[PDB]
Amino acid sequence: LGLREIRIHLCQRSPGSQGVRDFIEKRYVELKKANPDLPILIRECSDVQPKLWARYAFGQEKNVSLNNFSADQVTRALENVLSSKA
Amino acid sequence: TRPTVRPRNDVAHKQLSAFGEYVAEILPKYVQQVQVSCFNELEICIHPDGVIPVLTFLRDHSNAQFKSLADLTAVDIPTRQNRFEIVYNLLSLRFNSRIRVKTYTDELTPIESSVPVYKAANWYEREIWDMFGVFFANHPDLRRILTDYGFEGHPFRKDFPLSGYVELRYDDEVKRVVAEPVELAQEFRKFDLNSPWEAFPAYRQPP
Amino acid sequence: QLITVDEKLDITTITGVPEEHIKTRKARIFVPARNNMQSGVNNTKKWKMEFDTRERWENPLMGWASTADPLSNLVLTFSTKEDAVAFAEKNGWSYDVEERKVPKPKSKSYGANFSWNKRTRVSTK
Amino acid sequence: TSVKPIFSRDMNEAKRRVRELYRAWYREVPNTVHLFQLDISVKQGRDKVREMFKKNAHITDPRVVDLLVIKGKMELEETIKVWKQRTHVMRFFHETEAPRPKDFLSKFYVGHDP
Amino acid sequence: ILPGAAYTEKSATYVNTEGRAQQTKVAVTPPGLAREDWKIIRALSEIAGMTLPYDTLDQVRNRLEEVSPNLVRYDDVEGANYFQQASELSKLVNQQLLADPLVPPQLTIKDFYMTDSISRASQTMAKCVKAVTE
Amino acid sequence: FAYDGLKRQRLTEPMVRNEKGLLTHTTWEDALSRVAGMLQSFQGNDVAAIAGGLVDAEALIALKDLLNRVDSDTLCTEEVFPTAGAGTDLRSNYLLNTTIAGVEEADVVLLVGTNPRFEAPLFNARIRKSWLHNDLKVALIGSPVD
Amino acid sequence: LHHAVIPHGKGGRSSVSGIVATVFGATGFLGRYVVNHLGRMGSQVIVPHRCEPYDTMHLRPMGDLGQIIFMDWNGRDKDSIRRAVEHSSVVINLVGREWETQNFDFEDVFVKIPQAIAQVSKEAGVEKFIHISHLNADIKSSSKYLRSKAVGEKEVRETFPEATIIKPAEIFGREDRFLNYFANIRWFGGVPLISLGKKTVKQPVYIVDVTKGIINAIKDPDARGKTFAFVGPSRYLLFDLVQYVFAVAHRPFLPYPLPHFAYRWIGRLFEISPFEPWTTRDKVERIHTTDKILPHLPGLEDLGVEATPLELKAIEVLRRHRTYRWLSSEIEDVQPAKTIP
Amino acid sequence: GVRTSPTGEKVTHTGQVYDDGDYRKVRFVGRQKEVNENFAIDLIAEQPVSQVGSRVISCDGGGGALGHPRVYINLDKETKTGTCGYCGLQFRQQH
Ligand SMILES: NC(=O)C1=CN([C@@H]2O[C@H](COP(=O)(O)OP(=O)(O)OC[C@H]3O[C@@H](n4cnc5c(N)ncnc54)[C@H](OP(=O)(O)O)[C@@H]3O)[C@@H](O)[C@H]2O)C=CC1
Numbered sequence A: 001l002g003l004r005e006i007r008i009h010l011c012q013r014s015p016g017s018q019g020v021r022d023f024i025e026k027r028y029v030e031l032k033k034a035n036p037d038l039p040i041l042i043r044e045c046s047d048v049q050p051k052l053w054a055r056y057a058f059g060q061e062k063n064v065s066l067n068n069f070s071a072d073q074v075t076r077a078l079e080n081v082l083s084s085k086a
Numbered sequence B: 001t002r003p004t005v006r007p008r009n010d011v012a013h014k015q016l017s018a019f020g021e022y023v024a025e026i027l028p029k030y031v032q033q034v035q036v037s038c039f040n041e042l043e044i045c046i047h048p049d050g051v052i053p054v055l056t057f058l059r060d061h062s063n064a065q066f067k068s069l070a071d072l073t074a075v076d077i078p079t080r081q082n083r084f085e086i087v088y089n090l091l092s093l094r095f096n097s098r099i100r101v102k103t104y105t106d107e108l109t110p111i112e113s114s115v116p117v118y119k120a121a122n123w124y125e126r127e128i129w130d131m132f133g134v135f136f137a138n139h140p141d142l143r144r145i146l147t148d149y150g151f152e153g154h155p156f157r158k159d160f161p162l163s164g165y166v167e168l169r170y171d172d173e174v175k176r177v178v179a180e181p182v183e184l185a186q187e188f189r190k191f192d193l194n195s196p197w198e199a200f201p202a203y204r205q206p207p
Numbered sequence C: 001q002l003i004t005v006d007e008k009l010d011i012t013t014i015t016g017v018p019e020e021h022i023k024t025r026k027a028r029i030f031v032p033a034r035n036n037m038q039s040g041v042n043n044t045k046k047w048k049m050e051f052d053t054r055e056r057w058e059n060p061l062m063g064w065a066s067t068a069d070p071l072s073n074l075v076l077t078f079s080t081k082e083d084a085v086a087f088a089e090k091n092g093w094s095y096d097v098e099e100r101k102v103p104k105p106k107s108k109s110y111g112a113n114f115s116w117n118k119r120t121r122v123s124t125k
Numbered sequence D: 001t002s003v004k005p006i007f008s009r010d011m012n013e014a015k016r017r018v019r020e021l022y023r024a025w026y027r028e029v030p031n032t033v034h035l036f037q038l039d040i041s042v043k044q045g046r047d048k049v050r051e052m053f054k055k056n057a058h059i060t061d062p063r064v065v066d067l068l069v070i071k072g073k074m075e076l077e078e079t080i081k082v083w084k085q086r087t088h089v090m091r092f093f094h095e096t097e098a099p100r101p102k103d104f105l106s107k108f109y110v111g112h113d114p
Numbered sequence E: 001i002l003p004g005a006a007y008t009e010k011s012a013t014y015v016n017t018e019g020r021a022q023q024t025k026v027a028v029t030p031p032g033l034a035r036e037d038w039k040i041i042r043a044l045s046e047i048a049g050m051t052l053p054y055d056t057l058d059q060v061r062n063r064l065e066e067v068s069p070n071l072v073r074y075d076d077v078e079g080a081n082y083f084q085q086a087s088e089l090s091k092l093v094n095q096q097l098l099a100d101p102l103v104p105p106q107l108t109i110k111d112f113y114m115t116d117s118i119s120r121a122s123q124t125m126a127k128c129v130k131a132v133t134e
Numbered sequence F: 001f002a003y004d005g006l007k008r009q010r011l012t013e014p015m016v017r018n019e020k021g022l023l024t025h026t027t028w029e030d031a032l033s034r035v036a037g038m039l040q041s042f043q044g045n046d047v048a049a050i051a052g053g054l055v056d057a058e059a060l061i062a063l064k065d066l067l068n069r070v071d072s073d074t075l076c077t078e079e080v081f082p083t084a085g086a087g088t089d090l091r092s093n094y095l096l097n098t099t100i101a102g103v104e105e106a107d108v109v110l111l112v113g114t115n116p117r118f119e120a121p122l123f124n125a126r127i128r129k130s131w132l133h134n135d136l137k138v139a140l141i142g143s144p145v146d
Numbered sequence G: 001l002h003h004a005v006i007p008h009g010k011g012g013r014s015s016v017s018g019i020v021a022t023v024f025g026a027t028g029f030l031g032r033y034v035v036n037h038l039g040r041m042g043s044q045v046i047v048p049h050r051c052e053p054y055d056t057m058h059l060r061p062m063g064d065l066g067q068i069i070f071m072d073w074n075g076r077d078k079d080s081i082r083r084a085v086e087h088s089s090v091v092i093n094l095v096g097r098e099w100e101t102q103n104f105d106f107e108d109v110f111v112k113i114p115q116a117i118a119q120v121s122k123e124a125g126v127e128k129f130i131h132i133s134h135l136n137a138d139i140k141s142s143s144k145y146l147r148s149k150a151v152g153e154k155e156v157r158e159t160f161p162e163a164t165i166i167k168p169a170e171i172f173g174r175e176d177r178f179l180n181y182f183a184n185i186r187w188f189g190g191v192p193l194i195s196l197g198k199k200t201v202k203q204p205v206y207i208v209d210v211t212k213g214i215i216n217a218i219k220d221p222d223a224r225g226k227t228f229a230f231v232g233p234s235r236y237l238l239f240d241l242v243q244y245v246f247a248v249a250h251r252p253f254l255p256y257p258l259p260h261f262a263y264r265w266i267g268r269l270f271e272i273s274p275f276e277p278w279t280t281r282d283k284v285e286r287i288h289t290t291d292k293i294l295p296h297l298p299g300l301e302d303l304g305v306e307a308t309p310l311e312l313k314a315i316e317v318l319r320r321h322r323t324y325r326w327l328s329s330e331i332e333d334v335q336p337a338k339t340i341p
Numbered sequence H: 001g002v003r004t005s006p007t008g009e010k011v012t013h014t015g016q017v018y019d020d021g022d023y024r025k026v027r028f029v030g031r032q033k034e035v036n037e038n039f040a041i042d043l044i045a046e047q048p049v050s051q052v053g054s055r056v057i058s059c060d061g062g063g064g065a066l067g068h069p070r071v072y073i074n075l076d077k078e079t080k081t082g083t084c085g086y087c088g089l090q091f092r093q094q095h
């Protein structure tokens, strides 16, 4: 019943995604380097509320809003997805 | 006098222009536009509230005397906020002249019935209601006139399809004529005829 | 005396259209592309509304193209995009709007055909 | 947002016109079945009247309601005066329509229409 | 074999090399018993008991928006960033380059005309191939 | 001119193998049930899918969502792209980030292991347009193609 | 599928259903409904007919242009049967008389002609074959009509093993010889019945139910090699049925028993007409035969058809039998007949 | 020339013929397939090629105003003949 895929949607220029943009610039390479086999799909799009998608076994999905989240809270939200697995 | 060109009659153009501004001066409450065409037809464009006052003035005023309602019709122009243009074509036997009066309305707004001004308008307004769906208030007996009993929609609207939505046939099982969704053995063929080159510069619209 | 009506214009219940051809249709609002075979631009001035293409089949008797779509030939003309969108909302049609494509302005120079040192020098006339 | 009314100035006034029409349609069905010699029952006809009123229960524009009542009244006048024929009265029941399944799979089998 | 629709026969989304999303329009309907491709799989899922949660073209496009939000921004090129990170990760695993010279599959015009099922089935392309070779 | 291939070799009916192992026409209901049966007996790595070159995005997600419901992730494409490092995690890694119109803004173009004339004819046309009007410089690593 | 038989359209008059059907005996009572339902959806119908062309005119408006094709045929001429069936995908056999003529007897119409059609249809490679038999078909039946149905039903089974065989009860409809039959007895005063109609039970079935069942069998892949019993939803005592017929028609009902022997004498007297007999001895036997109960055979419900009660459609058939005084009585004015639970 | 298919059905000058197994040929049963047996492709090939002296010749199809629009045919290519695009007559430059 474990995790299969993670998607991060964010805007390139919006201030609501600044923390998410910060997280990718700083902690993405080491997180990917930690999980070499787990697809982490970062998909930018203009004027979209930043959001996290986690896909577990047999297609179950959950999404978390990251609007206004800090670089710290993004690390927390992913750390939830990578830790507890629904 | 070039043989193939329609001659221009300027005495009538001046006469119609004079009467046009005469109407506008007398009825500024309702008249929005007055124009005369290059083939000498005067059109008065009015606010819909002025249908009865304008038509009554044109019928009764001694310098108008438009006693005959030649025609009353509507035009559907979907791009407009008020899509329906209502057109009264009047004739003056006394002054051997014609005038056109135009107003507007939409799907949900009624127009005052002009039957009290011209009894000719009774069936014309029934036709406009039947074919365009424009409701006329205080009409003596408004109801479909041209379409089939129970027909749904207003065929002369531009968004009504040419072949309609239903068609009839005789069904032997129920021993009566039945109505069913329209299917055509040969679809009507749409032709794109417009040339991509401008034809009439004089009517060019600014960009 | 005027009344205050405070809802979006909806005329779907008084248009006579069947339910199938309101909810299931997809209207396209667009300015037609210029037919590439001709240089005239006079057919790219007005906005158009068309509906999604549906099945056509061959008539068994003659092989003609039969259809069951009452809207197959319906095309509407509008002055502006807003007018077309206003029409689509009150009739209850889902619609897609494609932005107008205006040719980009170009810099043309006949004298550039004879450049002293640039590649725009033409080898024939 | 100030528009000219047709009849009813607001929804409460319009709804009263709806109920007056519904009573007239409800009372007329027994005569319609008798006069047109329809094989349906008085219950079947009255159920059809309900069905036609129920499909327009989501309207909140008093003007749209007034037009529906106007068209309903005209629709009733044709029936009472026997301007309609039996074919026109029985067009409400679509007796020759083969039912069209509304589920995805049944549609998927029969064609491309959604 | 499940017969599907060609690109002229469906309203489908395609993303070009820029990442620009664009949609086709139905010009004709599929032939015979062929069906819209996403509808075949949706129909299959219901039969299999694992019904997918979208029954129309618009709904399945809402699903595309949840996976990659730019797949529904039609005619828009959404910019993509973070080349610095993609370059850092590309240096983790070293690998050798082959001694083979870089040779594209298409060297001359004859190699251009047939490259997919549609053009392979095309008699006009076959005429073109015969012409350039001969 | 390849549109005339849409009138040839077309699949117009579902097919299944008969007792002789030969393809024979059948109905959607039969063909779908036969596939539906096998899909219910397999899970995970036993079920895979390959997407060809002409597949639309609506079909691509529907097939992924279906195979994800048997806990399969083997959703593959024929065209290769290296997965090392970022792989497909970052869109910039597998896009033409300058855009087609951006070629007109470049002063140097370095082409590597490609024949844009046949791979992307209208992208090669854009390069020649810049080559001609902007005096663009072009360099190529690979087979010396015209 | 050949490309020209793949369905297209939305199921209307101009659509293509993919069915190419030869309907034998399409000019009778059941035939006009079957042809109507095939034409509605855009089927190619071949109507081989024996009668004068004027008597097929009511069939012409049932199909789009070209969809109804008429041919001549002779029940004894097997060349004329290949011509009619050799382009078809389904063959429907609806041939039958309720009387014997000088030229055709019950064996001819219910054995020799059904067998010839099936044997020729089998040779032509016709995929599907629908044969109409009778609910009460039995070898030991007192009615020779029903004895031939049993022999014919069996013969069609060996000849065309994959044939769908349908066994309807008595059918009621505008042009039936059932409800119309009872309503017409008024011309003789009382209504004679064997044992006062207290010994016979009937389960009549609506014509449209039978037609829909036939049409669903063509399309249902599981109807092949099966035998169906098309019966109505309610079983009635004959006396209750005939009394209800007279109530709906608003005609005075004067039943009186008539013994079996004396009421064959009347049947023999009506057989002398060289025209269509008003009644026959065999007709007397069939009307008084109790409808069989055959639970082992699938019914209308197994073909997606929901049987129509006699009460909904009796007025549709019997209104024309009323006098002016009663023409406008509604459906509710007559209480339903008592049923056998 | 009008041909008969192995099913016996005549082949039209447009190449149309119901293939064996096409139900649609039932429409001809007890009737006939209307086929015009003067194939225009064959008739025009029987005309002699006309030798002319000039490099350019004109064709109006004959009959002046009763023919087709007047066209002009180049005859410089000596491997082939100049054919009228309206009526199919052929022309040749004599030496
Ligand atoms: N109550 C019912 O109606 C029931 C009917 N059935 C069976 O259903 C079938 C049709 O019923 P129905 O339609 O009422 O019967 P009809 O008598 O109403 O029509 C019978 C058809 O058979 C044709 N036919 C009869 N004899 C011959 C013949 N010797 N040669 C050629 N054609 C012939 C007639 O053609 P023409 O018109 O040219 O004479 C007619 O088209 C019959 O098999 C009947 O036994 C079964 C159970 C009950």
Ligand SMILES: [Zn+2]
Pocket (backbone or CB within 6 Å): H059, H060, H061, H068, H084, H085, H086, H087, H088, H089
């Ligand atoms: Zn010529």
